[PDB]
PDB file of C-alpha atoms in Angstrom:
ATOM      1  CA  UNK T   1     129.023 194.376  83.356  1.00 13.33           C
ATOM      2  CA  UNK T   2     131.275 191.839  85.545  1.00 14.06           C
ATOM      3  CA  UNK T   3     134.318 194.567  85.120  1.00 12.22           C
ATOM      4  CA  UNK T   4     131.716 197.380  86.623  1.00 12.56           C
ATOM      5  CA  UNK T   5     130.943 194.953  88.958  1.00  9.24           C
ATOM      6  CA  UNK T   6     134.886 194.322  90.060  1.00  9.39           C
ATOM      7  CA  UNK T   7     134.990 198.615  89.889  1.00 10.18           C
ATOM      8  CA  UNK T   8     132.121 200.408  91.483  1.00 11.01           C
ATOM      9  CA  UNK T   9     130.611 197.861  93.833  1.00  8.97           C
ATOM     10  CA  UNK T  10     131.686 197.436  97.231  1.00 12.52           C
ATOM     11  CA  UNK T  11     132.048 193.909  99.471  1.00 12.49           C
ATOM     12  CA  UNK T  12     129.528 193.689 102.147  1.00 11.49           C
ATOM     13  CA  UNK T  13     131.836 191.534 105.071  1.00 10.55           C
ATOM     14  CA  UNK T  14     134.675 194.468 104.895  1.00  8.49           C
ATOM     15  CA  UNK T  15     131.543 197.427 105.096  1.00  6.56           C
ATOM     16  CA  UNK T  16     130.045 195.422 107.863  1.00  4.27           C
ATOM     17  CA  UNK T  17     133.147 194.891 109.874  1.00  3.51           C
ATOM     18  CA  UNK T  18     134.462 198.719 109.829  1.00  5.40           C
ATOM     19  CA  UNK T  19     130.821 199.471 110.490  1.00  2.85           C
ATOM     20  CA  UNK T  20     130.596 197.676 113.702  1.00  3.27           C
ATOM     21  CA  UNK T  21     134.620 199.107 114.622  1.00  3.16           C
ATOM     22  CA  UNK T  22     133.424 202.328 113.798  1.00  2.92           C
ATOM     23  CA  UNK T  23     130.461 201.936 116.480  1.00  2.00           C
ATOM     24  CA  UNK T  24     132.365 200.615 119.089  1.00  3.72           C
ATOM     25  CA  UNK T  25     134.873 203.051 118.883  1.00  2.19           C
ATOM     26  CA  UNK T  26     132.209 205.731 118.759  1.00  2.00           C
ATOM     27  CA  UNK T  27     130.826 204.278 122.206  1.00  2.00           C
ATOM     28  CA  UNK T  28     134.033 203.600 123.532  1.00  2.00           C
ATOM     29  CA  UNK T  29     135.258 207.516 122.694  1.00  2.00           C
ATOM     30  CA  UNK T  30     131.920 208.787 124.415  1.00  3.81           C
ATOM     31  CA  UNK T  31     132.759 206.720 127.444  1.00  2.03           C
ATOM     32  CA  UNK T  32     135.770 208.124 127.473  1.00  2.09           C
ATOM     33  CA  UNK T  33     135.002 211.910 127.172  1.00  6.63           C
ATOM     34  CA  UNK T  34     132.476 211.580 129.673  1.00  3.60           C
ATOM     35  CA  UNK T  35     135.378 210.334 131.839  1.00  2.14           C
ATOM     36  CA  UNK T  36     137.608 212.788 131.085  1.00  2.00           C
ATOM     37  CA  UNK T  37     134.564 215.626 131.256  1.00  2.00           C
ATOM     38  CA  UNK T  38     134.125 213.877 135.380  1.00  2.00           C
ATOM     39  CA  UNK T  39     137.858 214.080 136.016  1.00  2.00           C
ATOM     40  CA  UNK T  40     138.051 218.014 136.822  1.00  2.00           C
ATOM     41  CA  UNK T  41     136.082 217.278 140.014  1.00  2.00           C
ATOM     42  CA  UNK T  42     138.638 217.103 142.110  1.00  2.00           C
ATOM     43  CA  UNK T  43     139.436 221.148 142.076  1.00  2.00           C
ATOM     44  CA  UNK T  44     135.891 221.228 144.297  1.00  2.00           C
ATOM     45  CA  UNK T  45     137.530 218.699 146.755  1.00  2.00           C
ATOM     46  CA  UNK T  46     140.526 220.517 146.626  1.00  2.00           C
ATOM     47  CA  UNK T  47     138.751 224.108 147.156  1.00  2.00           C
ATOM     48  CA  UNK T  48     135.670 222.586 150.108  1.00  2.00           C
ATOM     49  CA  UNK T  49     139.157 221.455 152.224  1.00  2.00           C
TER      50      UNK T  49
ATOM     51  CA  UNK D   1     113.512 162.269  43.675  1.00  2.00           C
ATOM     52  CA  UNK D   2     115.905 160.234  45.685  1.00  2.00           C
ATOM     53  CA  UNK D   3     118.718 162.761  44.959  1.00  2.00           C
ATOM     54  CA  UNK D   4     116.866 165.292  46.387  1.00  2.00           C
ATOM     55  CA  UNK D   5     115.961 163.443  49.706  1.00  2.00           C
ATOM     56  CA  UNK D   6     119.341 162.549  50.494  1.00  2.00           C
ATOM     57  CA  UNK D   7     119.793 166.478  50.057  1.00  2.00           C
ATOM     58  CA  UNK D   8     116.837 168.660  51.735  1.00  2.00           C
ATOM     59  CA  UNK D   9     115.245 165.967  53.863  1.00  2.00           C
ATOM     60  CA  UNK D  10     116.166 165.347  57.762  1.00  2.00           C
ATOM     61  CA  UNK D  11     116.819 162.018  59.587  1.00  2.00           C
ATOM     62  CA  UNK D  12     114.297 161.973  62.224  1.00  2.00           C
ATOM     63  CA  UNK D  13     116.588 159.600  64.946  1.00  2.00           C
ATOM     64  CA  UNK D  14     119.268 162.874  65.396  1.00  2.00           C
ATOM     65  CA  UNK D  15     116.843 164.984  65.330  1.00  2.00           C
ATOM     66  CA  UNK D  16     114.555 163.689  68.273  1.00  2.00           C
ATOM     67  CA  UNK D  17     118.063 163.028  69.873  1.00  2.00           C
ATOM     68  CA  UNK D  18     118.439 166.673  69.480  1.00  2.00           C
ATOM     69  CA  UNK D  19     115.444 167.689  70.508  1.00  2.00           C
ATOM     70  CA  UNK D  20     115.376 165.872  73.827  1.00  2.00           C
ATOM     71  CA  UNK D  21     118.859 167.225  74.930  1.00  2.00           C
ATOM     72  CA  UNK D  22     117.890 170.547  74.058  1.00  2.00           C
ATOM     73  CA  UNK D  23     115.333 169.843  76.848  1.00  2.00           C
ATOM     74  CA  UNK D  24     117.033 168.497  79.490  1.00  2.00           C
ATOM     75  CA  UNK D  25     119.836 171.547  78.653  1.00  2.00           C
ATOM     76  CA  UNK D  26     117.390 174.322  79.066  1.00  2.00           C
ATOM     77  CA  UNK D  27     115.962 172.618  82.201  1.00  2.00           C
ATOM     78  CA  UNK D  28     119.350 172.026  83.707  1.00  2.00           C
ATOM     79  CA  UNK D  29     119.636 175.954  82.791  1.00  2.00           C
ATOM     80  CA  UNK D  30     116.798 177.009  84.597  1.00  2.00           C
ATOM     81  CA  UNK D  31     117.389 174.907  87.764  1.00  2.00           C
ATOM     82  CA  UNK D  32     120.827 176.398  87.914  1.00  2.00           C
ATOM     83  CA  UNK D  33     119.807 179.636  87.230  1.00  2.00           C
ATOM     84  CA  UNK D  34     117.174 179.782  90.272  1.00  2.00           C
ATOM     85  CA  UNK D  35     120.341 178.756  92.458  1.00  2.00           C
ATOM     86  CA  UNK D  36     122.533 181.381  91.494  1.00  2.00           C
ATOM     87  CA  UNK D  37     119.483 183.637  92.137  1.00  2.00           C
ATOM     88  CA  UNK D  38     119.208 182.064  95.300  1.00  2.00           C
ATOM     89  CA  UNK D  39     123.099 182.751  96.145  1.00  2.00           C
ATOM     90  CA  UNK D  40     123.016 186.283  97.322  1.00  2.00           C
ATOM     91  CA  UNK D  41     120.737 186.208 100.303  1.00  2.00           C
ATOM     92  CA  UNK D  42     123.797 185.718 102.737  1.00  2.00           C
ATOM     93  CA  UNK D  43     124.304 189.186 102.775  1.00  2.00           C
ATOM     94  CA  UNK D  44     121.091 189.730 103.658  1.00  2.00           C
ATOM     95  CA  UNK D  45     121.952 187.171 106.669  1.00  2.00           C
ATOM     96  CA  UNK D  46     125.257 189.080 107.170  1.00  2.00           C
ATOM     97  CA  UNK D  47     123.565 192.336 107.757  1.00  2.00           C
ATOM     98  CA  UNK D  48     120.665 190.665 110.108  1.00  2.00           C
ATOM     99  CA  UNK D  49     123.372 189.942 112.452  1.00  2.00           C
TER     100      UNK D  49
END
């Protein structure tokens, strides 16, 4: 039972961690994209003189 | 008759000596099996936060 244990199981700290890195970098990537998604804005500028 | 109780018959003295370590084993047992029970909760406290 101990060797299934050391097998299947998984550690709780390391799932937690690369849960909460996973999230942030989720956020961080929306952030972004809504960024980039704001940058073409310019072209109206460019076009209204 | 005395051949036969130095054979079959016990010696009381080991026996109670037995009997009370036996005790205090099985209640050492329990206590430390209630803490080992008690161990795992911190991952409940890692996934709280």
């Amino acid at each position: 039972s101990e060797a299934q244990s050391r097998i299947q199981d998984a550690d709780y700290a390391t799932e937690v961690s690369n849960m909460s890195k996973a999230q942030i970098i989720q956020q961080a990537g929306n952030s972004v994209l809504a960024k980039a998604n704001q940058v073409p804005q310019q072209v109206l500028s460019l076009l209204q003189g």
